[PDB]
A paper describes a structure:
Indeed, an unbiased approach, utilizing systematic domain exchange within chimeric CCK1R/CCK2R constructs to identify the region of CCK1R responsible for its cholesterol sensitivity, demonstrated that a cholesterol-association (CRAC) motif ((L/V)-X1-5-Y-X1-5-(R/K)) in transmembrane segment 3 (TM3) of CCK1R was responsible for the functional impact of changes in cholesterol levels. In summary, CCK1R is sensitive to elevated membrane cholesterol, disrupting its normal stimulus-response coupling primarily by stabilizing Gq/11 interaction leading to a reduced CCK-8 dissociation rate, higher apparent binding affinity, and lower potency for intracellular calcium signaling. In contrast, CCK2R is insensitive to elevated cholesterol, with slower G protein activation and slow peptide off rate, even in a low cholesterol environment. These distinctions in receptor function are dependent upon differential cholesterol interaction with a specific CRAC motif in TM3 located in proximity to intracellular loop 2 of the receptor, a region that is known to be important in G protein activation.
Resolution of these complexes was 2.51 Å for CCK1R(sterol 7M) and 2.59 Å for CCK1R(Y140A). These structures required stabilization of the receptor complex through use of a guanine nucleotide-insensitive G protein analogue, with further stabilization of the bound heterotrimer by scFv16 that spans the αN helix of the chimeric Gα subunit and Gβ.
Numbering used by the authors:
A (entry chain R): 38 to 238, 305 to 386
B (entry chain P): 1 to 8
C (entry chain B): 2 to 340
D (entry chain A): 18 to 59, 207 to 225, 232 to 254, 265 to 303, 306 to 320, 330 to 394
E (entry chain G): 6 to 62
Write the structure that this text describes.
């Protein structure tokens, strides 16, 4: 029972912290009108998408993995699977949105004055949410309880997802891991690379540059594992499941969700301009 | 038995 | 020796002025108003926000009907607002963006505007072609216009950085009188309710009372430690108030020729930008550099309320002729209407 | 019908708030003897363009300075050639630098007619006006001692207070120099970069 | 002569500003107090009018 006891402690802690962090960022950024800058529009959007990711991924992956059957109805398997992919998708384009905005402001300061506005930020927010809700539509369609029976002769289920053939399954998993992880991570490596280079070309500058390196590291550590696993299963579902099913994939998933825990820390709480906003937001 | 995993 | 003799005669006369005032100083306003009742807490709230300006609002003036107002911004727009609906009735492109003052004619036919251009421009609202147009440009000051106020569709009074005031005939475009006697830049102006007199306040901390017909300084008032930014007649025309970088307001009565009251609190530490009175002249409303506006009980001198709701300097302030609303403008580019 | 007019007005006032945003606004300060009108290479006002970025200078022919509290940079011009008024410029520069309304505007400082300073020092009485120039110790070495001493005095005023909110960008200029537009452009690039770092939550 | 010429005016002006007739400040104060009481009920800022009568809602 030790591995289950650790697994519930880890998930419940990371859940409570990701709820608290994102809801505080949402709170302090809505109350303080002063803190309403192009960047803080993306941080508010990001914190909402991370709050959805926390609420709809974490408990609904934990509880079935503890019970060893999917306890909720087909409507819950459909609805959760939609919001999981939706929240994961919006976040990865809000993190590539913050890196390309920061790069325009820091490496081309005059030219960006033409377009970098609060209205332009809200165009990119609206386009990102709408295109995420759009492309994730297969999830509530082809995600339906699949039945089996336990050794106690109880009927049991496992929520799963299946395009109509294996070529569609493989091409789909290749598309999501090359447009919701790979390129989103090579454009955050070249954006924060160029910002670090031009910024370094001194103690404050080195304090900035180590944060830019930590951001591109934490992105690849959270997401590479889960996006590579899904691709493994879509090719040899049998070998992938024989290796990773049960306890191992639950930690690859926890590592993925830990992104929605760290984002409030590295983007908000590490800057007192917001930390004071916090001190100004509450009595 | 319970095998595989949801995508996210 | 004549220069010294005058100088001693001026010192003796100035000493006489002080003695005549001191002899007149029989009781303070706060000794007379000791028994009255306080304006209680003036709880007040924003009823409207006007969102069209894209830079610092510098000035605003109500029309004679308490619906229309004009406002000036350093984006180079003069905007006329229907405050009831918030509709923009008109937007006028100014020829220079560095404006510091705006006025509405009592007829509603015209608005006036000026600043670092050293000109007062008159705009005709009621043309047959349906577009607002320049009626005349009044040129003759050698320093920036700080304030302006029409007496009628043919006459307007102006204050300037060149230490003067001037009265203009708008039809001829010429000064009918120049008023001279301030030594610092004149920052503000206020016409008496009968339009026979006006007061102006300056950077040398003087306020002066002028005869509009005869072109003379009747009286000079002093008390502030620093430049006067704002001045306003009390509704009866027998008194006025000033505000300054001193972080205080003063009240004077013309007939006693001296200060009756000073409004201050040791937590208030920044300059006053603007002042105006309610319809009874029982409340003095003042704008501040600390982004607030404060409501003072002009007779008990207590701080009665706060209009907190701007993200920068309250740059200008005005009560309507009905007494039903206060407008405040600001360096964040919005006006707000209150109560 | 009145509201259709208000929205058609609010659309043209937004189309004008953009044409405004495309330009950088600069204020000129300095006494006569400074050559302000010769730092210019293209309320009085004038316009110029560098690398497709558009600039608008303004000079007024303690109160009127408040209007300029949101310009990108003050261009402050000093005559370097005689020291009778050097302290006057230093008191004036102190008055600009510590102004309540200018606490976040960086100053581009032009130490102008530096060739006449070089001629005066190569021929100057400078230590009679500034006794602490005796044994100063950092072109001709003596001219460099004067230039760096002259510069040192303004930049030490500029660093005695400021808290990193705004900075001073000193330059030496001859009346024949064309490069002042490039210098203003680079320093505006740097001023905009410094605030973009704090607004983009990097510091 | 400009300083002496100007100073004669600065003297004349003080002669005018002294020739004026001043009243006791207790009378001046009592008039502002009497005015505000006579115009108290007619001032919607010191006591707000009901939302039916208020033109700004």
């Amino acid at each position: 029972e030790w591995q289950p006891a650790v697994q519930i402690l880890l998930y419940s802690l990371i859940f409570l912290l990701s709820v608290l962090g994102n809801t505080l960022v949402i709170t302090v950024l809505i109350r303080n009108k002063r803190m309403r800058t192009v960047t803080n529009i993306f941080l508010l959007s990001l914190a909402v998408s991370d709050l959805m990711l926390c609420l709809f991924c974490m408990p609904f992956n934990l509880i079935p993995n503890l019970l060893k059957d999917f306890i909720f109805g087909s409507a819950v398997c459909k609805t959760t699977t939609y919001f999981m992919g939706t929240s994961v998708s919006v976040s990865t384009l809000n993190l590539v949105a913050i890196a390309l905005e920061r790069y325009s402001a820091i490496c081309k300061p005059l030219q960006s004055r033409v377009w970098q506005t609060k209205s332009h930020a809200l165009k990119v927010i609206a386009a990102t949410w709408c295109l995420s809700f759009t492309i994730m539509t297969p999830y509530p369609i082809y995600s339906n309880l699949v039945p089996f029976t336990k050794n106690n002769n109880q009927t049991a289920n496992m929520c799963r997802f299946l395009l109509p053939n294996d070529v569609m399954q493989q091409s789909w998993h290749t598309f999501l891991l090359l447009l919701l992880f790979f390129i989103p991570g090579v454009v955050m490596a070249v954006a924060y690379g160029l910002i670090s280079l031009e910024l370094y070309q001194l103690m404050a500058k080195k304090r900035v540059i180590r944060m830019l390196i930590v951001i591109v590291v934490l992105f690849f550590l959270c997401w590479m594992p889960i996006f590579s696993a899904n691709a493994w299963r879509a090719y040899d579902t049998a070998s992938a499941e024989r290796r990773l099913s049960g306890t191992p994939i639950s930690f690859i998933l926890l590592l993925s969700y830990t992104s929605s825990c760290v984002n409030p820390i590295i983007y908000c709480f590490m800057n007192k301009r917001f930390r004071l906003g916090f001190m100004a937001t509450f009595p | 038995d319970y095998m595989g995993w949801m995508d996210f | 020796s004549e220069l010294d003799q005058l100088r001693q005669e001026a010192e003796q006369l100035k000493n006489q002025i002080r003695d005549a005032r001191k002899a007149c100083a029989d009781a303070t306003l706060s000794q007379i108003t000791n028994n009255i009742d306080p304006v209680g807490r003036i709880q007040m709230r924003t009823r409207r926000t006007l969102r069209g300006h894209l830079a610092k609002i510098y000035a605003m003036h109500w029309g004679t009907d308490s619906r229309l107002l004009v406002s000036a911004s350093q984006d180079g727009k003069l905007i006329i607002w229907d405050s009831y609906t918030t509709n923009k009735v008109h937007a006028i492109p100014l020829r220079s963006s560095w404006v510091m003052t705006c006025a509405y004619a009592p007829s509603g036919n015209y608005v006036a505007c000026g600043g670092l251009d050293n000109i007062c421009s008159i705009y005709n609202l009621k043309t047959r072609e349906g577009n607002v147009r320049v009626s005349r440009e009044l040129a003759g000051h050698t320093g920036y216009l700080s304030c302006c106020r029409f007496l009628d569709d043919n006459q307007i009074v102006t204050s300037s950085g060149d230490t003067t005031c001037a009265l203009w005939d708008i039809e001829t475009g010429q000064q009918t009188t120049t008023f001279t006697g301030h030594t610092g830049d004149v920052m503000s102006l206020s016409l008496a309710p009968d339009t026979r007199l006006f007061v102006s306040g300056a950077c040398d901390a003087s306020a002066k009372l002028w005869d509009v017909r005869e072109g003379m300084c009747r009286q000079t008032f002093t008390g502030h430690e620093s430049d006067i930014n704002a001045i306003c007649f009390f509704p009866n025309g027998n008194a006025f108030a000033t505000g300054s970088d001193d972080a205080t307001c003063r009240l004077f009565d013309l007939r006693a020729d001296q200060e009756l009251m000073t409004y201050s609190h040791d937590n208030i530490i920044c300059g006053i930008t603007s002042v105006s009175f309610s319809k009874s002249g029982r409340l003095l409303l003042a704008g501040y550099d600390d982004f607030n506006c404060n409501v003072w009980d002009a007779l008990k001198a207590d701080r009665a309320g706060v209009l907190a709701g701007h993200d920068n300097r309250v740059s200008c302030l005005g009560v309507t002729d009905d007494g039903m609303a206060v407008a405040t403008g600001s360096w964040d580019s919005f006006l707000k209407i209150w109560n | 019908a009145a509201v259709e007019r208000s929205k058609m007005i609010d659309r043209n006032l937004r189309e004008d708030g953009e044409k405004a945003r495309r330009t950088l606004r600069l204020l000129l300060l300095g006494a006569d003897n400074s050559g302000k009108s010769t730092i210019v290479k293209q309320i009085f006002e004038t316009k110029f363009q560098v690398d497709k970025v558009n600039f608008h200078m303004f000079d007024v022919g303690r109160k009127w300075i408040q209007c300029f509290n949101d310009v990108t940079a003050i261009i402050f011009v000093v005559d370097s050639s005689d020291y009778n008024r050097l302290q006057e410029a230093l008191n004036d520069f102190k008055s600009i630098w510590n102004n309540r309304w200018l606490r976040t505007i960086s100053v581009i400082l032009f130490l102008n007619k530096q060739d006449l300073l070089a001629e005066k020092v190569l021929a100057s009485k400078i230590e009679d006006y500034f006794p602490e120039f005796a044994r100063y110790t950092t072109e001709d070495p003596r001219v460099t001692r004067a230039k760096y001493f002259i510069r040192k005095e303004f930049v030490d005023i500029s660093t005695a207070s400021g808290d990193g909110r705004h900075i001073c960008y000193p330059h030496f200029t001859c009346a024949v120099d064309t490069e002042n537009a490039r210098r203003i452009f680079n320093d505006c690039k740097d001023i905009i970069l410094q605030m973009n770092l704090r607004e983009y939550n990097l510091v | 002569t400009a300083s002496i010429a100007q100073a004669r005016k600065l003297v004349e002006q003080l002669k005018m500003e002294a020739n004026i007739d001043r009243i006791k400040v207790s009378k001046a104060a009592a008039d502002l107090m009497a005015y505000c009481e006579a115009h108290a009920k007619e001032d919607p800022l010191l006591t707000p009018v009901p939302a039916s009568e208020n033109p700004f809602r």
